[PDB]
Design a binder for this molecule. Structure first.
Ligand code: GNP
Ligand code: CA
Ligand code: CA
Ligand code: MG
Ligand code: MG
Length: 166
């Protein structure tokens, strides 16, 4: 079957794992569980076609930047996650976007910019700000809550469609 190599990137704690676990295991559990590097392979049907989502869930820890080159090198499309209550994580996702472009020698990489934790009240990143960044990349912006599942399928399946339409 068609395989889609999806990589979930972003600063520590923005909800990269929570998003992936909601998609694959249909649940949210509030818990502290930092990622080193985890792989989820799930066969899905998207728009009538069977495909294998090969999802790499990465670490937000700054001490892993050398290891980021490797999975950016081999990754097909990227969920670029920040949290809407964490302005620093929004600044950081600019750096991820630039690194993806440098490692892959391309500004045509399928990506979706994801503003996660949209269930939370203390918003500090406005949607228009994130939309401006996504426009500069030519990519969609989608808000998500791993907690409520709002936008989760939207974000992952839109990334698949962005790859498929590449
Ligand atoms: N309210 C709310 N909390 C969330 C959401 N997504 C994740 N969290 C919470 O935020 C924390 C970090 O989530 P996690 O998925 O582990 O983040 P991560 O980006 O994978 N971290 P790491 O880079 O260390 O692997 C956890 O307490 C988790 O329960 C969300 O959409 N809403
Ligand atoms: Ca181009
Ligand atoms: Ca597009
Ligand atoms: Mg994680
Ligand atoms: Mg280069």
């Amino acid at each position: 079957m068609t395989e889609y190599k999806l990589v979930v990137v972003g600063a520590g704690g923005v909800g990269k794992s929570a998003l992936t676990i909601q998609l694959i295991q249909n649940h949210f559990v509030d818990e502290y569980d930092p990622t080193i590097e985890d792989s989820y392979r799930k066969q899905v049907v998207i728009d009538g076609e069977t495909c294998l989502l090969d999802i790499l869930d990465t670490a937000g820890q700054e001490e892993y930047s050398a290891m980021r080159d490797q999975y950016m090198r081999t990754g097909e499309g990227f969920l670029c996650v920040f949290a809407i209550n964490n302005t620093k994580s929004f600044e950081d996702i600019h750096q991820y976007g630039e690194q993806i472009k440098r490692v892959k020698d391309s500004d045509d990489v399928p990506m979706v910019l994801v503003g996660n934790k949209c269930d939370l009240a203390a918003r500090t990143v406005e949607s228009r700000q994130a939309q401006d960044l996504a426009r500069s990349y030519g990519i969609p912006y989608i808000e998500t809550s791993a907690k409520t599942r709002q936008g989760v399928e939207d974000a992952f399946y839109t990334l698949v469609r962005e790859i498929r339409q590449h």
